[PDB]
Design a protein around this ligand. Structure first.
Ligand SMILES: Cn1cc(-c2cc(NS(=O)(=O)CC(F)(F)F)c3ccn(C(C)(c4ccccn4)c4ccccn4)c3c2)cc(NC(=O)Nc2ccccc2F)c1=O
Length: 127
């Protein structure tokens, strides 16, 4: 099986804006998570060919990773903060679906999710 192409990150047919919440999601939330020691397996799409995980994309139909989220924020892909937050949530839940509870990669995702939820509690005031 081939890896699927990565998720779309730019679309000039989608309207574009910068907002206080989107700026915070890139500069504070993504930046904090990205620099965490456990972030490295989530910085790019799961490369199922490289990892010899041929069943990954037989089960995970909405892949998501922080590299894609970073590119979406840099390309003004998201109009609402919730769209970005939904992508982080999808990345975590994909991990909890494919991997057995308590496995290494799940424990890494759980620590990142706890930090993510703490930062989302400090989302700045909307326009
Ligand atoms: C979200 N996500 C991400 C990865 C993942 C991604 C990688 N690189 S990447 O290029 O894809 C993404 C990038 F660039 F950002 F790093 C690598 C490169 C090496 N590794 C390890 C050593 C590994 C394992 C556990 C914890 C940490 N590192 C690895 C991988 C495969 C087999 C053994 N060890 C990776 C793991 C795996 C998942 N799941 C998984 O590996 N599940 C699994 C494996 C074997 C048996 C049972 C399983 F469920 C999953 O969900």
């Amino acid at each position: 099986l081939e890896n699927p192409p990565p998720p779309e990150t730019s679309n000039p047919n989608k309207p574009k804006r910068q907002t206080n919440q989107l700026q915070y999601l890139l500069r504070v939330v993504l930046k904090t998570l990205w620099k965490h020691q456990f972030a490295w397996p989530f910085q790019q799409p799961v490369d199922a060919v490289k990892l010899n995980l041929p069943d990954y994309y037989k089960i995970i139909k909405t892949p998501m990773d922080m590299g894609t989220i970073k590119k979406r924020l840099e390309n003004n892909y998201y109009w609402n903060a919730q769209e970005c937050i939904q992508d982080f949530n999808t990345m975590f839940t994909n991990c909890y679906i494919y991997n057995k509870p308590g496995d290494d990669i799940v424990l890494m995702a759980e620590a990142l999710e706890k930090l993510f939820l703490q930062k989302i509690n400090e989302l700045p005031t909307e326009e």
